[PDB]
Structure 1
Amino acid sequence: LEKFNLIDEPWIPVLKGGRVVEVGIGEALLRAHEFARIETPSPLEEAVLHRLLLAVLHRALSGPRCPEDVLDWWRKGGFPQDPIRDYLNRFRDRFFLFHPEAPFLQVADLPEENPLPWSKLLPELANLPKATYAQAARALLVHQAFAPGGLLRRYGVGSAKDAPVARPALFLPTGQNLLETLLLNLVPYTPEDDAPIWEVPPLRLGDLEGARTKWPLTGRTRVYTWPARGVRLLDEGDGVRFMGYGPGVEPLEATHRDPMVAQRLDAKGNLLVLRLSEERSFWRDFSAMLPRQGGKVAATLEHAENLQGELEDEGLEGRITLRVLGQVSDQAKVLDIRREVYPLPSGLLTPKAEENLEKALKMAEELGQGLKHLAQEVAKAVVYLEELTKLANSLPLERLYWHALDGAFPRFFARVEEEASLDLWREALRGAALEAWKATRRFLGTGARHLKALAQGEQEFGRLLGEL
């Protein structure tokens, strides 16, 4: 009845001594330094597991109030243990996956009748097995953070809203062990006016039907642990197949921006979240998220960058990277789920580095626009408005330019501080363009009808390279 406490049971997959083991929240926190990282094939799982741990840390430590505190914990090789133990002991009865009164992130009195398969908790890209408790716990957490809005038609609610991070790309700086990673994401915090889901009374069906409960979407840990859907996992005895399901605390608009989320301006000066895109390389938005461009850097990245500087002034230099986690989405559809890894350059947020990044990205965009135009002129020379489309799209020119730069970007990015770095980039731009046009020649060189386009294109491509 009372079963499977997330503080003590193995459900969090972490890499330890080269193998994947599963731990509970207590061990993950108190012994963070022992694990290389949270290790899962799912980038959504990785994102939410860190956000849950961070929620717990922020509340248990009532901070960190200052970056200096994070540095201390870095130096000591661990978090304060007693505050964490005390907090976990106080809220332990709220961390049972199954519970007659307060099951974790669930609604105790959702009816068991006419349930949905637990598979609904999982992303559907573009019979039914029994989940273990650990897998149901993880699927629950993912669903509460990433469920896209859409049709619901249950308990008086026609359609549900987006869970809090359904859309944006999440910035997760990463260190050499789980302790470092948590520290790199522990942005200075004060507890006032915030509370995670387990610090407030359990939700009941009567509060959720017709969407009666509406909360402003604010408060760091309230947002990290947002109850986006009503869920009640049903215990088969040693696993889960089905769940009660309904709304949904309604998100009300607020000024709060999630620490892992970055923003940019659109052409009209509206602020939009950075978002993973189906075909557009993500790093292409890295200069637009900068304030100098009207954008906003993710707080985790601002904090990690600052921490990285302070560790440098102490000779405590460590190996720090940037993971980007999120969904590629389209309304109620989840097209894809992605994990991206980038270096996290030491001086990234200085004026010179920012200046270099701005230029590097601008060159790459101008050339890519020249290439796109070239591809359009080739297609037209060859050839109904449907015919052109397939043709230009089928040409390997733009795809290969950008694909080549995806490989070149990390090398440049790691050196964004150095003046020399633009030159490396220009070299990479040249090779990317040359490599991509070579491949288009190869394509154009096989048909007699392709030859006019080819002669014209080679000349235009010559123009483009010159200006570089």
Structure 2
Amino acid sequence: EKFNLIDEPWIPVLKGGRVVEVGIGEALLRAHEFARIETPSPLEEAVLHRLLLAVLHRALSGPRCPEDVLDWWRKGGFPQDPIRDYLNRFRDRFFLFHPEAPFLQVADLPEENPLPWSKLLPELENLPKATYAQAARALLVHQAFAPGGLLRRYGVGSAKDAPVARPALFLPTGQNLLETLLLNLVPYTPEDDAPIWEVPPLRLGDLEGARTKWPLTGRTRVYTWPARGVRLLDEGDGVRFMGYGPGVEPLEATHRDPMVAQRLDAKGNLLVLRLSEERSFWRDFSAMLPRQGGKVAATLEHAENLQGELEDEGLEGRITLRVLGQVSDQAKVLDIRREVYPLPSGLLTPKAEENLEKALKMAEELGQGLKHLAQEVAKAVVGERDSPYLEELTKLANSLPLERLYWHALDGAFPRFFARVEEEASLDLWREALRGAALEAWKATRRFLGTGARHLKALAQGEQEFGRLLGEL
């Protein structure tokens, strides 16, 4: 019995400009003292929020109504008795090491032939000892973000994706940790849900051969999913190795995680919004709207509603939106990313949404034209069909700064536009930004094209076509 997550320092928070570590108790009871959960890993940031939310939802058996969240923001804190009563009732499920119920672990996982604790981390002797605080964070992350793939332990060939292994996570944020939790405390009922610690401790017998299958539903059940079997092995003052086996098999269900958005395919399947490379995330902001017809993250929906109510009572209504997740290449993870945007005053109003649809359409049409222009340049430079011809064309086209520079410039301009999406004058700001991004990108392509006599016919033609595109704004 060692290291209780309610009491020990393990959640890194910003307090008065310095980073300190706190336990679940203090993070909740004193949320307003911390500017934010502060960690270099976006996955850590996400899970630490999801765990705290899980506790709040159960301790508070709510909030049932958006009005309750406002009352708590107004008072400047959560009701405290319910929270300390709840933390007291479940204290003994919150030890990192425990004879019978270690937090998010399997007590009877075999101690011998363990794996390095590094397996928990995204990948993405020379094995360092982790602290309990680090082991705790790495566990929470792996349990939420682990991709499917080969396992081959205890009668399980391959494991399934952990719950949020794939989608971008929408996390609205305010001026302090209290406000940030409030902004994510989507109205909730306890019925038929339960986080991992409210259920009997899992045993290897239940997990071997994937014997235990759960429908992937229930908010706090999902926030605290036992995706893998883990048993961290205490080495005295830290952790190097763990027992490792299958977790609970997720059965498919209707439930959508509150932090997850959706959009439609090109006819006509719903998919989760994802982080990717080669695509700016905001380019999907219109497709996630109901009239498109995707589904907005419940957290985003709830924050935007709350913001409207804070503005109505003269309270500070300025909020930020953070998007957290993994870029994943099938079953590899390519990157961990944190994106940051304004949460515009009246985002989910017909006018703002309509400004958004137009803005993204303009950018997308101009970008499509720039893309074709780059393909024509590439054809012009290379020549006619005879290294693989088409690969040499794709190589060359990808080699031009045209599209890449265009989108990179719009990443810069989007937030200042987005923040004013409610207004009508913002379309004109955006139009100019489109023009400017296009110009800078083309200039950089002119430079690239003036280094040998080869590139010139393509330059002449391209200049002509670029003139065209621009004349249509």
What TM-score, normalized to structure 1?
0.99
Deviation string 1:343-369 (CA, Å, 9 cap, x unpaired) is: 000100000000000000000000000
Aligned-partner Cα distance in 2 for 1:331–1:408 = 31
Q: Which moved more, 1:361-370 or 1:117-126?
A: 117-126
Aligned-partner Cα distance in 2 for 1:207–1:268 = 41
**Would you say the 8 A contact 1:126–1:333 is kept in 2?**
no
Q: Return closer, same or farther for 1:243/1:126 CA change in 2, 3 Å cut-off.
A: closer
Deviation string 1:254-309 (CA, Å, 9 cap, x unpaired) is: 00000000000001210000000111000000000000001000000000000000
**Would you say the 8 A contact 2:29–2:77 is kept in 1?**
yes
Aligned-partner Cα distance in 2 for 1:113–1:446 = 63
**Would you say the 8 A contact 2:317–2:345 is kept in 1?**
no
Deviation string 1:32-61 (CA, Å, 9 cap, x unpaired) is: 000000000000000000000000000000
Aligned-partner Cα distance in 2 for 1:379–1:139 = 46
Determine helix, strand or coil for the equivalent of 2:340.
strand
1:261-410 equivalences under 5 Å are 261-383=260-382, 384-410=389-415
Aligned-partner Cα distance in 2 for 1:269–1:71 = 38
Q: Return closer, same or farther for 1:406/1:228 CA change in 2, 3 Å cut-off.
A: same
| Structure 1 unaligned residues grouped into runs of 5+ | none
Shift of 1:395: 0.3
Determine helix, strand or coil for the equivalent of 1:159.
strand
**Would you say the 8 A contact 2:155–2:209 is kept in 1?**
yes
**Would you say the 8 A contact 1:175–1:318 is kept in 2?**
no
**Would you say the 8 A contact 1:264–1:274 is kept in 2?**
yes
**Would you say the 8 A contact 2:290–2:296 is kept in 1?**
yes
**Would you say the 8 A contact 2:308–2:346 is kept in 1?**
yes
Determine helix, strand or coil for the equivalent of 2:375.
helix
Aligned-partner Cα distance in 2 for 1:161–1:447 = 53
Aligned to 1:461: 466
Aligned-partner Cα distance in 2 for 1:110–1:7 = 24
Determine helix, strand or coil for the equivalent of 2:163.
coil
Aligned-partner Cα distance in 2 for 1:394–1:202 = 55
Deviation string 1:136-159 (CA, Å, 9 cap, x unpaired) is: 000000000000000000000000
- Equivalent position to 1:446, from 434, 440, 451: 451
Shift of 1:318: 3.9
**Would you say the 8 A contact 2:97–2:232 is kept in 1?**
yes
**Would you say the 8 A contact 2:308–2:317 is kept in 1?**
no
Aligned-partner Cα distance in 2 for 1:426–1:279 = 22
Q: Which moved more, 1:32-41 or 1:315-324?
A: 315-324
**Number of corresponding residues:** 467
1:33-52 equivalences under 5 Å are 33-52=32-51
Shift of 1:125: 1.1
Aligned-partner Cα distance in 1 for 2:315–2:368 = 43
Aligned-partner Cα distance in 2 for 1:203–1:424 = 56
Aligned-partner Cα distance in 2 for 1:41–1:199 = 31
Aligned-partner Cα distance in 2 for 1:241–1:102 = 20
Shift of 1:71: 0.2
Deviation string 1:145-181 (CA, Å, 9 cap, x unpaired) is: 0000000000000000000000000000000000000
* Sequence identity percentage: 100
Determine helix, strand or coil for the equivalent of 2:254.
coil
Determine helix, strand or coil for the equivalent of 1:322.
strand
Aligned-partner Cα distance in 2 for 1:252–1:7 = 31
Shift of 1:330: 1.5
Shift of 1:430: 0.1
Determine helix, strand or coil for the equivalent of 2:434.
helix
Q: Return closer, same or farther for 1:148/1:126 CA change in 2, 3 Å cut-off.
A: farther
Aligned-partner Cα distance in 1 for 2:113–2:276 = 37
Structure 1 residue runs of 4 or more that deviate by more than 6 Å after TM superposition = none
Determine helix, strand or coil for the equivalent of 1:202.
coil
**Would you say the 8 A contact 1:126–1:334 is kept in 2?**
no
Deviation string 1:214-237 (CA, Å, 9 cap, x unpaired) is: 000000000000000000000000
Deviation string 1:88-124 (CA, Å, 9 cap, x unpaired) is: 0000000000000000000000000100000000001
Aligned-partner Cα distance in 2 for 1:29–1:386 = 55
Aligned-partner Cα distance in 2 for 1:386–1:120 = 37
**Would you say the 8 A contact 2:210–2:249 is kept in 1?**
yes
Aligned-partner Cα distance in 2 for 1:125–1:206 = 32
| Structure 2 unaligned residues grouped into runs of 5+ | 383-388
Determine helix, strand or coil for the equivalent of 2:295.
coil
**Would you say the 8 A contact 1:175–1:320 is kept in 2?**
yes
Aligned-partner Cα distance in 2 for 1:78–1:106 = 32
Deviation string 1:402-423 (CA, Å, 9 cap, x unpaired) is: 0000000000000000011111
Shift of 1:319: 3.0
Deviation string 1:7-36 (CA, Å, 9 cap, x unpaired) is: 000000000000000000000000000000
**Would you say the 8 A contact 2:50–2:223 is kept in 1?**
yes
Deviation string 1:388-436 (CA, Å, 9 cap, x unpaired) is: 1211011000000000000000000000000111110000000000010
Determine helix, strand or coil for the equivalent of 2:150.
strand
Aligned-partner Cα distance in 2 for 1:391–1:155 = 49
Determine helix, strand or coil for the equivalent of 1:341.
strand
1:141-156 equivalences under 5 Å are 141-156=140-155
Q: CA RMSD in A?
A: 1.1
Aligned-partner Cα distance in 2 for 1:391–1:331 = 26
**Would you say the 8 A contact 2:318–2:345 is kept in 1?**
no
**Would you say the 8 A contact 2:320–2:341 is kept in 1?**
yes
Shift of 1:126: 22
Aligned-partner Cα distance in 2 for 1:376–1:430 = 20
Determine helix, strand or coil for the equivalent of 2:63.
coil
**Would you say the 8 A contact 2:307–2:318 is kept in 1?**
no
Determine helix, strand or coil for the equivalent of 1:112.
coil
Aligned-partner Cα distance in 1 for 2:61–2:186 = 12
**Would you say the 8 A contact 1:51–1:224 is kept in 2?**
yes
**Would you say the 8 A contact 1:126–1:336 is kept in 2?**
no
Shift of 1:341: 0.3
Aligned-partner Cα distance in 2 for 1:263–1:103 = 35
Shift of 1:445: 1.1
Shift of 1:317: 1.6
Determine helix, strand or coil for the equivalent of 1:467.
coil
Aligned-partner Cα distance in 2 for 1:265–1:69 = 34
Determine helix, strand or coil for the equivalent of 1:264.
strand
**Would you say the 8 A contact 2:170–2:322 is kept in 1?**
yes
